[PDB]
């Protein structure tokens, strides 16, 4: 019940084998290259020849259905203010969702980072009503918006807003059961009421960036005594975990980040 969420995949077979050897059981990878922006209206970019994505023959049909989880390209901004950018984002989102369905991915991740996502909901509903029941749609959403987490380093220059964003999206999509949450945990946690409300949602996965892990006397990564409560309450929900980031504890192997997370599970209150 853990994933790696690698944003770079040199070779699919190698990455999958290495991740499996580290104790995980599924991999969150980008279906398309994160930087391979594509054009769909203006020539000559729309005539880009050659394959646009790695062929699906690299993995067995069972493997796609169970071990891989798609991620939307980071350059897609359906709600942009530039009409051309908006149309490109819509086309790219539709293409990537269709490819994810073609592979049969069990789950697909979409980011929420802005208070307006009406166009994204429109596109996602248009996709959902095609008739394929293959995949769910996890919606990445953080506890604290980036605008409230910045380090206050600028010189020149309310915690519920993230749940407001989630609520607006899920009501736009008409509470479709195929839309679930992928709550992302930050270094700091909000008030108890905010988390209590957040646990009343259909959270299917939780994201634990390695940057939030403290360091133990011995040196292995470890979570703070307040993160432990949230992790336990999530475990009660049987939510999937997605350890993302890099080896901030370079001395120890990445596997440690997961071994500790097992210690909590086997030490869960009876």
């Amino acid at each position: 019940s853990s994933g790696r969420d690698l944003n770079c995949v040199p070779e699919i077979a190698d990455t999958l084998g290495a991740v499996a050897k580290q104790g995980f059981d599924f991999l969150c990878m980008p279906v398309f290259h994160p930087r391979f922006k594509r054009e769909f209206i203006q020539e000559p970019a729309k005539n880009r020849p050659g394959p646009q994505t790695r062929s699906d023959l690299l993995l067995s049909g069972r493997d796609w259905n169970t071990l891989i989880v798609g991620k939307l390209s980071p350059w897609i901004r359906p709600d942009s203010k530039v009409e051309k950018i908006r149309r490109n984002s819509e086309a790219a989102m539709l293409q990537e969702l269709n490819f994810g369905a073609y592979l049969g991915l069990p789950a697909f991740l979409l980011p929420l980072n802005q208070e307006d996502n009406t166009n994204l909901a429109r596109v996602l509903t248009n996709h959902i009503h095609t008739g394929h029941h293959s995949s769910m749609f996890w919606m990445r959403v953080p506890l604290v918006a980036p605008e409230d987490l910045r380090d206050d380093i600028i010189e020149n220059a309310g915690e519920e807003k993230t749940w407001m964003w989630w609520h607006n999206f899920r009501t736009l999509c008409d509470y479709s059961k195929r839309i679930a949450v992928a709550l992302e945990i930050g270094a700091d946690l909000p008030s108890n009421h905010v988390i209590d409300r957040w646990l009343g949602e259909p959270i299917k996965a939780a994201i634990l960036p390695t940057s939030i892990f403290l360091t133990n006397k011995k040196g292995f990564p470890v979570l703070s005594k307040m993160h432990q409560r949230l992790i336990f309450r999530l475990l009660k929900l049987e939510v999937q975990f997605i350890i993302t980031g890099t080896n901030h504890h370079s001395e120890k192997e990445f596997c440690s980040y997961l071994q500790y997370l097992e210690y909590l599970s086997q030490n869960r209150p009876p």
Partner: peptide
Amino acid sequence: TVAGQFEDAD
């Protein structure tokens, strides 16, 4: 494995 491998930090 290591004694305190998962012991809580201060």
